[PDB]
Amino acid sequence: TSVYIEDVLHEFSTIPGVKEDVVEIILNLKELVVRFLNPSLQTVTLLLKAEGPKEVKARDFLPVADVEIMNPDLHIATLEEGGRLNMEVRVDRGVGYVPAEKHGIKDRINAIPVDAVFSPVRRVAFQVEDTRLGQRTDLDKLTLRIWTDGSVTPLEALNQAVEILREHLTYFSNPQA
Amino acid sequence: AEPGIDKLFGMVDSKYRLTVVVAKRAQQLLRHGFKNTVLEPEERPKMQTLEGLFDDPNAVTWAMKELLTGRLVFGENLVPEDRLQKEMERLYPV
């Protein structure tokens, strides 16, 4: 949701000793997958302190309790000799796609709001086959295929979707007339 | 389309006469704060606001609905303008 980089005022700047500009670093961060092991955890801040020369990845974030990085091999930046990257990434929990202009979350003065795509599910397909039982041949076999980023397993996502649909079906219970 | 627009066009010999009547009635309604209306309380145009239903502030809608009801008399050389305004002020103080 938010990123703050030391000695960086806005996202339209370049960091000395860093090959990527702040826009590219934020784009890389948007692909970071963070899994909260605590259901009551709503916000985390991951601290990254790196010194060149190196290829700073997602595994270089400092470990946090009840927080896991599902893609440690994600490339974040390339630090050249003499370059430093001190940054704090605020990761929130939510639903849907919230642009940075809507939430506008800044932990401090120089924090940069980041467009947040909270949906863990990457792709959904469903397939219908002509299964047969007994003497009837018009039956349906349904197969749901779910690709998820790994923070939420596909079974958990399916269970949540079923529960949401059930809760919405309960909305047809009390007629207001 | 405006509700009852066909009837409004058919109630006058010229559509611009209809427009003139509607506009003059709307101005009469605005000047007297909608207290000179010929609409029953169940016939007043209403708008849905977050607080609730309120009286429609658009006087043209009120004039069109009143003309649809048929309780308005329109024409030329009906009454003197000064006398009409004075009597309307007297019956409906503002």
Binding site: - | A1, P3, G4, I5, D6
Partner: protein, 315 residues
């Protein structure tokens, strides 16, 4: 137009029977198609009209929803006390108009059920609705038509592919005939029986005749083999395109004019699907530029004429 156009089949297309049971049994055996025109005993009908007889539009559209029949299949429906033989798409259009105008009888009298709804039929429907109902009901009908047309054009499956520009098999034969006639004209000119101007005129007439024949072949192929072709449907319904553009896409580009006005002796024998050559593209560029300049200089004259007409009749 997509929902109000009916299907035509060719599998059966002509077999004669004695009783409708034999025609049906032939249908389940796969010998005759659903919409193929057949003769039961003496009358010409189709398997769709006999197999599917619906008691009301609700049952017909319920069968359509269950995939029993499509909107384009010609079936029998009991509508307004009459045993109509139409498609569920046309009955659906009738219901659309009836619900838009909130009057079954007037809406029935306003529409032409037995034809697909092109631009002209829709315009006539709008005009008749305006005459019979007024501005309010006509605007309601216009909104209903807009909604249903958008929904059905979305769910129908209209798309443009490279194979949708069907090349007729007659184009090659027509081009070979034109080449042989051109060789004959050249031999006659070498023999001196005709001069330069009449040879050029004969070449132009031959190429114009070939262009017309190719246009006719393109549209005949569309109306016979691909009646639901996207280009053909768009042209016929009036949604988009004219036969000239359909020819340029499907047939041949045709003759092009020099910047002086004269037409080149060699036409553009290749369409846009086949792809023009560099020379043909440069030749067509002359006409394209001429048309663009004409359009550019015509706006000023039209506006000046409009201002003159306003200022002479403003009072």
């Amino acid at each position: 137009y997509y929902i109000t156009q009916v299907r035509k089949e060719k599998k059966g297309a002509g077999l004669e029977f004695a009783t409708p049971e034999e025609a049906l049994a032939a249908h389940e055996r796969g010998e005759v198609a659903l919409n193929a025109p057949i003769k039961v005993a003496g009358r010409e009908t189709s398997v769709g009209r006999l197999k599917y007889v619906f008691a009301n539009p609700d049952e017909a559209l319920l069968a359509v929803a269950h995939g029993i029949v499509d909107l384009q299949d010609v079936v029998t429906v009991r509508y307004m006390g009459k045993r109509l033989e139409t498609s569920p798409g046309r009955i659906l259009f009738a219901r659309i108009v009836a619900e838009a105008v909130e009057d079954e009888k007037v809406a029935w009298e306003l529409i032409q059920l037995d034809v697909p709804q092109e631009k002209n039929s829709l315009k006539d429907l709008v005009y008749q609705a305006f005459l019979r109902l007024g501005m309010e009901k006509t605007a309601r009908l216009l909104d209903a038509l807009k909604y249903y047309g958008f929904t059905f054009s979305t769910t129908s499956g209209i798309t443009i592919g490279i194979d949708d520009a069907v090349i007729p098999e007659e184009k090659k034969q027509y081009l070979e005939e034109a080449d042989r006639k051109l060789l004959q004209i050249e031999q006659a000119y070498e023999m001196g029986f005709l001069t330069d101007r009449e040879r050029y005129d004969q070449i132009l007439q031959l190429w114009t005749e070939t262009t017309e024949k190719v246009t006719q072949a393109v549209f005949k192929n569309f109306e016979e083999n691909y009646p639901f072709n996207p280009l053909y449907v768009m042209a016929q319904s009036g949604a988009r395109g004219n036969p000239q553009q359909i020819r340029q896409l499907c047939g041949l580009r045709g003759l092009m004019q020099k910047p002086s006005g004269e037409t080149f002796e060699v036409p553009v024998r290749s369409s846009f699907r086949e792809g023009l050559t560099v020379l043909e593209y440069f030749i067509s560029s002359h006409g394209a530029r001429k048309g663009g300049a004409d359009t550019a200089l015509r706006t000023a004259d039209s506006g000046y004429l409009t201002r003159k007409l306003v200022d002479v009749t403003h009072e």
